[PDB]
Structure 1
Amino acid sequence: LLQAEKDRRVLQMLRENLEEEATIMKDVPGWKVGESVFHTTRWVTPMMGELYGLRTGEEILSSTYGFIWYT
């Protein structure tokens, strides 16, 4: 159950974050909207900057660095 909620949440961040990118980068030349840099057609695990990117500090610090120095 935790696994299913986790998968839906990370795909939710993927969908919303690529929507944000598609809104934000229509000025630069080139730039396909959602290319993986990789070549194989496989779901790679994202890198915590694809998930928690441009969230402005608070949630990314409480998410990445939470357990590391939480007690």
Structure 2
Amino acid sequence: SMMRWNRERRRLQIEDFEARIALMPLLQAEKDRRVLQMLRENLEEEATIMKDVPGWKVGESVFHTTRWVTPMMGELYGLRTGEEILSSTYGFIWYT
């Protein structure tokens, strides 16, 4: 009985994983536009905040490379509210 039922459960797992795979390009495009939205918002607010500070280059990368670095949590949610910070950085850890 466990032979038949675990083989059916593996087929069900593959069906769920193929549903995930088919949804992943839409989610990846949405995530890319999401993080570029948040970085452009942080860049514009950095431009309108860091005007008095001497020698400040707005958008100055801390890496010598010109390669795209995956953005950090504080890079995205640093200027936003602490409620969104918690609900973006501890929620899956704290979810039930």
Q: Give the TM-score band, short-chain normalised.
A: over 0.9
Work out the CA distance in 2 between the residues paired with 1:56 and 1:62: 10
Alignment-derived partner of residue 65 in structure 1: 90
Higher relative contact order (CA 8 A, sep 6+): 1
Shift of 1:56: 2.2
Shift of 1:54: 1.7
Taking structure 2 as the reference length, what is the TM-score of the superposition? 0.72
Specify the structure having the higher radius of gyration (Cα).
2
Q: Which runs of 5+ in 2 are unaligned?
A: 1-25
Shift of 1:17: 0.6
RMSD: 0.6
Work out the CA distance in 1 between the residues paired with 2:89 and 2:54: 33
Q: Which runs of 5+ in 1 are unaligned?
A: none
Shift of 1:20: 0.3
Q: Higher helix fraction: Structure 1 or Structure 2?
A: 2
Taking structure 1 as the reference length, what is the TM-score of the superposition? 0.96
Helix, strand or coil for the counterpart of 1:46? coil
Q: Deviations over 1:2-38 (max 9, x none)?
A: 0000000000001011000000010010010001100
Count how many residue pairs are aligned between Structure 1 and Structure 2.
Answer: 71
